Amino acid sequence: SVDDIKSLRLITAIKTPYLPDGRFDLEAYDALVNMQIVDGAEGVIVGGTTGEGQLMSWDEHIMLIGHTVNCFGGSIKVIGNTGSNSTREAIHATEQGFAVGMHAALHINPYYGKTSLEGLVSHFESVLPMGPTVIYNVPSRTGQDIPPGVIHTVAQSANLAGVKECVGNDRIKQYTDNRIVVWSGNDDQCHDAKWDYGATGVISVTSNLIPGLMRQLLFKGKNPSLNAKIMPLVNWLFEEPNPIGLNTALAQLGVVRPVFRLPYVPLPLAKRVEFVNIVKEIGRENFVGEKDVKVLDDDDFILVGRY
Amino acid sequence: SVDDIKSLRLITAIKTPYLPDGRFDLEAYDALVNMQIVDGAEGVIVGGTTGEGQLMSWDEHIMLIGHTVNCFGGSIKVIGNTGSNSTREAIHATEQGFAVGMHAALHINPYYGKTSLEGLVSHFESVLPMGPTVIYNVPSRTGQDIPPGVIHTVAQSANLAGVKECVGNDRIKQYTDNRIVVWSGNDDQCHDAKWDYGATGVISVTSNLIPGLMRQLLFKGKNPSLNAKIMPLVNWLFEEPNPIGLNTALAQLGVVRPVFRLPYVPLPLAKRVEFVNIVKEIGRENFVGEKDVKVLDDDDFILVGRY
Amino acid sequence: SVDDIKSLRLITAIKTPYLPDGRFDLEAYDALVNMQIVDGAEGVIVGGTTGEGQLMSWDEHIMLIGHTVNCFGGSIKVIGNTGSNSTREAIHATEQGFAVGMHAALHINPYYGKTSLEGLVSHFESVLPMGPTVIYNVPSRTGQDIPPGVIHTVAQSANLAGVKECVGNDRIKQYTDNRIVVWSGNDDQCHDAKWDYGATGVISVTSNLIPGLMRQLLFKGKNPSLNAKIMPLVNWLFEEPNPIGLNTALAQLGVVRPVFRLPYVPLPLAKRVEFVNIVKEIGRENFVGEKDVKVLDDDDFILVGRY
Amino acid sequence: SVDDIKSLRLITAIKTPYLPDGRFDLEAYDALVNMQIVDGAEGVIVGGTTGEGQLMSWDEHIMLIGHTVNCFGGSIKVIGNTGSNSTREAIHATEQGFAVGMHAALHINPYYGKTSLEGLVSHFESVLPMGPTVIYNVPSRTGQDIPPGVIHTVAQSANLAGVKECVGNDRIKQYTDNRIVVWSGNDDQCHDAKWDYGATGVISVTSNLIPGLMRQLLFKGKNPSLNAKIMPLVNWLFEEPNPIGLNTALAQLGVVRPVFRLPYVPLPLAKRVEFVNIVKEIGRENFVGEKDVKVLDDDDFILVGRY
Ligand SMILES: [Br-]
Ligand SMILES: [Br-]
Ligand SMILES: [Br-]
Ligand SMILES: [Br-]
Ligand SMILES: [Br-]
Ligand SMILES: [Br-]
Ligand SMILES: [Br-]
Ligand SMILES: [Br-]
Ligand SMILES: [Cl-]
Ligand SMILES: [Cl-]
Ligand SMILES: [Cl-]
Ligand SMILES: [Cl-]
Ligand SMILES: [Cl-]
């Protein structure tokens, strides 16, 4: 149901952990989703940008979606990132994603191979009939800012749940004033988006590391001292493009193996020493996992190009 | 060999024509490549941005690369667009592309799922050893500008042929002053890139339509009036994201079927009328094909989502 | 659990129904699985020989498996047919199959590209660790009778549930006397198999049509007259290779569309007239669906090659 | 043309060699094909049963086809095994194969998921329009003997080059007496097929090892003692299902790496010792490669399940 999605506040763009040979680490993955559920995350994006969907083959991706529904579908909402810059792929991945039982679809606009505003309408209308859909706007990554007019055109579909919006709180307000549910895509803006700009919540990267704190941040009420306290973490996580920092942090925490699928590559030593201090400053207990945080040696990391 | 690639002036990023069901129209494609050859185009990019590589499955792409080499490899240089935002795909497509006898690879930086500068080097160094390589910078599309420092780092490989640069002529000059071969990726800039900024040539969209005229611009010396003559065609070609304009124009010229793979959608009626006038002004004899240019009506066009 | 699969008695090799363009018709499929549940079937093979697994791409197949698990997993055992003549495919299909929550895998011996008995052991040991496994012997189709020595060798794995045996009741006896669970894969034999030869049950084609009668046959005691009654149906079902008859019969009953993926093709008119009389003799009320059975015209059937 | 294929007398079903990680070893492959050309083989089957087409993903397969055409097409006829038990795959693989320039297609009848005789005609008629076709009958592997009637039905197409026939010389004679070109697919029968039953040639496994000797058997009249001389090699090659013996023999000769894709596993030590004697008796100079034949130890062999 659409309204079940519209009412979600904390959705995690869950990271996809790997085995040393590059394959998904499903044991680690399950542990990750369990810690999300425990600390009150209400949804997960499967193979989003943070989940490195762009580096998956489709059978892996659909497997991971079906897996998450199968294991956790009764505790958390499952949102498959089945979007693509290719309409054919979007169509195919969306209908199969829904068939294995995902609750909603995340659809970005075609990136790289940008299309016209007419083309966008055609693209979204190809997948909107399939079920609850969250449209995903991230111009910094795609090359194209989806204008409000396009969002209003396709909002005629009952199946539009809302927008994962990344251009900023000004855009969110443009939408939330006009009866369109929005989740902030930026962790450094999402407190204000929720409390001041009418966002329903966040689709979050940082909730991978501190789900409990991100829950407190969105559920209880305004709280700038909590927002300020997590900000040094948030900044560290985005000095290089996401999910490079997240990947690096989760491995320092022991919850995932220090394995990267290329083109991503871990943060250097100096940055890794820094994270240890950010953890110490915020308190290890707020971070996922139980293991003492490590700095890790350069030689600990495994980069995979062929898998 | 790298020097054979370094000397090419006119490279056409060839359009990929479709059958009504959405499969490749090899009959129309073959005729397109021959018309490139007749008018002195020196190389082709297979499945580039213009060629809609982004919408192809890999079997189809490798097929088209091998087809092009088999039928035309003796008369024209074949450069497979085997780049990707995924290193695994880039590695895999590039070695398979070379195995079927392509002459060079075009490699963009990872788009959408952007990586760090360190990751860029890792990405590029995974494929440079395989053969002659052209690195492709188009930050409008990718969201990441490849810094000259990165280009200079990877230029330690003897397999770097040069750069398809899209940021502008001033960037081109930064490279050409420093021993780096550059092809302009901007038709509205390529005349001046060649004569004022040290560029070796162009990797062209517009040459799909007027290959003879583009050749003249790079081969004969500064010609401000020929350059001014093509400008209205170029401006038309890029009013919407390439290859929408090109796809539309080739259908109007009757050299391809009016079949579009989504998310692309033809230019509207008014622009199509405009194109008939543009052809008139420049002269029909300068455009590919023999058939009278048509406006085409809306319902002539076939939009393919499932293929 | 392995013991759970071992205690299954009535398992249906469910047919895979299609839409006019050759894609899976999930609406029809869901209704077929429900009718199996209502008349007591305890498990289903998904994409078996009868389910035309041979004609699926793996994305489609894992989708179907995950769909069946998601919709029916709590009411019925889902056995994914993840075997292949390629160990790589078998490995990959099986692990993905279990990850989306299938209860067991069906594993044939490599067919067409036959391997040595040693190769057979290597192949089965590649997949047995992954979960509960039914080994499928059908030398009339594979070209290779799996010898009991091989079965006894691989039976060292705690994950071997049993054998889907197609050679005959005397083979079955060899196994059941020696503590190996067996399901007959021959409908014309399965009654004797279960009552006289120790078979735990059947993996059935005919239950697709008359699940209630197949249940009665296997559950309520030795019944020579009931067995004799179904035999005209069973014989008709296998005049041409299965599932040609079943596909035809289900269309005639109106429970699936008259759509065939090639290389399969429907039974001719005279045979379809014959099916109407078999239905009248057994009684329409014993067959899946509510609609009057039809002969159907030759022109009703759609044959799909490209999908 | 079709006639160009019909006059071919010695065709090799070339082995596909692998690198330690399971990928194609194009360097070894190129040496194998070169050796075939040197000793007068006039065509190759690419990815046949002997070439382990059944273990290949389609992209590496079309790659290998396109590679063989690009590198050797001027010197040898390239026949892609694009046949399948799935008509969709057969259609798809065949046209893509011809697109990259293969000279003919090898087409088997659907194995394992066997179809009706009407089904077979449908299946073959989907691919016969694409290019010169060789129909492949080997019921010991398919479970279905293609009857003469089906061949005569499909022979109405001018694109039927002929039949690769494995059932025996008597079958060959029913065809050759009725204007249909045949290649024997049995090395132990091919001498007599040619000289006594009107076969045009062989499509050979054994020519992978001793191409010159096979040439002599087929181009130089009856020679029962040359024929008897090769027979112990042929018997050794087929004691376990082909290509297990050939893969083993080629490793021993050092012209390929001792690498197997599962389910295939090498012949045991005793047979390897036996091969060394077979080589001594026939004479090393007749076999491919210059290196001294080795026994090889169990330890040397690499079995790949995941690639
Ligand atoms: Br590790
Ligand atoms: Br462009
Ligand atoms: Br058309
Ligand atoms: Br009962
Ligand atoms: Br229908
Ligand atoms: Br009735
Ligand atoms: Br080796
Ligand atoms: Br020797
Ligand atoms: Cl953004
Ligand atoms: Cl600049
Ligand atoms: Cl059997
Ligand atoms: Cl027996
Ligand atoms: Cl045979």
Author numbering:
A (entry chain H), B (entry chain E), C (entry chain G), D (entry chain A): 21 to 327
Q: Which text from the study accompanies this structure?
A:
The asymmetric unit contains two tetramers comprised of four identical subunits. Each tetramer can be described as a dimer-of-dimers, with the monomers within the two dimeric units ab and cd tightly bound to each other, and weaker interactions between monomers ac and bd. The quaternary architecture of the Vv-DHDPS tetramer is identical to the N. sylvestris structure and quite distinctive from the typical bacterial tetramer. Each monomer comprises an N-terminal (β/α)8-barrel domain and a C-terminal domain consisting of 3 α-helices and 2 short β-strands. The active site centers around Lys184, which forms a Schiff base with pyruvate and is located at the center of each monomeric unit. Three hydroxyl-containing amino acids, namely Tyr132, Thr69 and Tyr156, form the conserved catalytic triad with Tyr132 contributed from the adjacent monomer across the ‘tight’ dimer interface (i.e. interface between subunits ab or cd). Examination of potential interfaces within the enzyme using the Protein Interfaces, Surfaces and Assemblies (PISA) program show that each of the two tight dimer interfaces (ab and cd) bury approximately 1790 Å2 per monomer, which corresponds to ∼14% of the total surface area of the monomer. By contrast, the interfaces between monomers a & c and b & d, bury a surface area of approximately 630 Å2 per monomer. In addition, the lack of electron density observed for the N-terminal region (including the His-tag) indicates that this region is highly flexible. The larger RMSFs observed for the dimer include the key catalytic residues Thr69, Tyr156 and Lys184, as well as Tyr132, which interdigitates across the ‘tight’ dimer interface to form part of the active site of the adjacent monomer. These data suggest that the dimer possesses greater conformational flexibility than the wild-type tetramer, and thus formation of the ‘back-to-back’ dimer-of-dimers functions to attenuate protein dynamics.
The lysine-biosynthesis pathway commences with the condensation of pyruvate and (S)-aspartate semialdehyde (ASA), to form (4S)-4-hydroxy-2,3,4,5-tetrahydro-(2S)-dipicolinic acid (HTPA). This reaction is catalyzed by dihydrodipicolinate synthase (DHDPS), which is the product of an essential gene in bacteria. The ‘tight’ dimer interface also contains a cleft that binds the allosteric inhibitor, lysine, which mediates feedback inhibition in DHDPS enzymes from Gram-negative bacteria and plants. In this study, we show for the first time that DHDPS from the plant Vitis vinifera forms a homotetramer or dimer-of-dimers both in solution and the crystal state.
